[PDB]
């Protein structure tokens, strides 16, 4: 059983916007979902130090790196605090919508995309490289749950019947037909060594076979 939901019309323009503005520096993208990625981890090292039953669902706290050619695919996991289905539908949105709006006033204010993460809606730049985003993510105090959106202006969440995570967050990035040099063993090192150099958790990559 899947849900459908239109994004709120502010979040619609800005994917919209990232979607069809040519802008060439699209590698921010990895550096915006890692560092989402972190601050997921420490959310729950931080709730661990008083609970330790929180780490039950998995006590390693660590970043996955891991690029599929023939599905053209890049995938991002991390064993985070995770995402509710609240998050995934209303939560998020509500704590974003103001940075959003704050985000293109500022495009025209003589900032460039790269700023994103300024905005805590570092997220979304994952489509300039990708023309579809599917986030597996589960979380201790719900279920696990399957977001999925091509942008267009509406997005799907359903409950996710495959391999059990545990605890976290998974992003896929279906890449566009132009973007696989983000597949790529030398291009990924080279964007994780330029922009997140300084992650407090292990960042993986896993080598292609
Ligand atoms: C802000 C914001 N708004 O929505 C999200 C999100 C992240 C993953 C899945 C679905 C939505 C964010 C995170 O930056």
Redesign the pocket.
Same mark, same amino acid.
């Given at each position: 059983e899947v849900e459908t939901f239109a994004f709120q019309a502010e +979040?619609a323009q800005l994917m919209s916007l990232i979607i069809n503005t040519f802008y060439s520096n699209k590698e921010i993208f990895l550096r915006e979902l890692i560092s989402?990625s972190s601050d997921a981890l420490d959310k729950i090292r931080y709730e661990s130090l008083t609970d330790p039953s929180k780490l039950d669902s998995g006590k390693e706290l660590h970043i996955n790196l891991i690029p599929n050619k023939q599905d053209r695919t890049l995938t991002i996991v991390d064993t985070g605090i995770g995402?509710t289905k609240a998050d &995934?539908i209303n939560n &998020? !949105?509500t +704590?974003?919508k103001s /940075?959003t709006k704050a985000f293109m006033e500022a495009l025209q204010a003589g900032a460039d995309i790269s700023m994103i993460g300024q905005f !805590? *809606? /570092?997220?979304?730049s994952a489509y300039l490289v990708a023309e579809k985003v599917t *986030?597996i993510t589960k979380h201790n105090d719900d279920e696990q749950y399957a977001?999925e959106s091509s942008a267009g202006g509406s997005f799907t969440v359903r409950t996710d019947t495959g391999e059990p995570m545990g605890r976290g967050t998974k992003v896929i990035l279906h890449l566009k037909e132009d973007q696989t040099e983000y597949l790529e063993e030398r291009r990924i090192k080279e964007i994780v060594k330029k922009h997140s150099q300084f992650i407090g958790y292990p960042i993986t990559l896993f080598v292609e076979k």
């Open positions: +979040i989402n995402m &995934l &998020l !949105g +704590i974003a /940075g !805590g *809606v /570092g997220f979304y *986030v977001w």
